[PDB]
Structure 1
């Protein structure tokens, strides 16, 4: 497994911040429109994390312009320019799929004080 380990290690990002399910994060991703390249933000609740080395991913949910949207980011992709935690959430579960059935007041997540 050392050959593939070396291949994966040379590609991993070194500056991924720590975040947990239930946190609010802002993800800045590259967008190409013609010749221009710019950063677009996507901010929402982390509802799932897949810890898998170079194949790590995380899922962010938001309500956007009257519509719920989920994005599954590949953590080490160069498309993802940056990740930052905006608010720390207090949940028990690793996977918050129950939030898909909730809106407004029913979907609130308590802040994690630490």
Structure 2
């Protein structure tokens, strides 16, 4: 509907970069506490991207301190400030969920050239 997609192009942003599955993503989330509002990083592989225009998302996974953390985002939301790629890889899938039960040396993704 063009009554949906007339207001689903006002809320969106034009400052989102491009990434495939299987790469490390640096995400700067804004965080409130008290009166200060300040940035906080996030860094891990991304294993699930969902493309729904305004409703798009992805999932970042990192083994922080032993307790493995997954976290989905809302791509066109004002809680994310900026997103950067850091090292892009080459997986032949696009829902990497075998990187859930797998830790350490054998849970790698090899580098992508070009």
Band of TM-score, shorter chain: over 0.9
Secondary structure of 1:76's partner? coil
Q: Paired residue for 2:96?
A: 96
Write out per-residue CA displacement over residues 91-111 of structure 1, whole angstroms, 9 at most, x where no aligned residue: 011110110011011111101
Measured after TM superposition, the shift of residue 6 of structure 1 is 1.0
Partner SS for 2:44: strand
Q: Tell me the TM-score normalized by structure 2.
A: 0.98
How big is the shift at 1:48? 0.2
User: Where does structure 1 lack aligned partners over 5 or more consecutive residues?
Assistant: none
Deviations 1:43-93 (A, max 9, x none): 000100000000000000001011100110000010000100010011011
How much does 1:21 deviate?
A: 0.5
CA distance in 1, matches of 2:50, 2:34: 33
Choose between structure 1 and 2: higher helix proportion.
1
Aligned partners of 1:63 and 1:6: how far apart in 2?
41
Q: Runs ≥4 in structure 1, deviation > 4 angstroms?
A: none
Deviation (angstroms), 1:17: 0.4
Structure 2 unaligned segments of length 5 or more: list them: none
Partners of 1:37 and 1:25 in 2: CA distance = 22
Question: Within 5 Å, which residues of 2 pair with 1:2-81?
Answer: 2-81=2-81
- CA–CA distance in structure 2, aligned partners of residues 6 and 98 of structure 1: 39
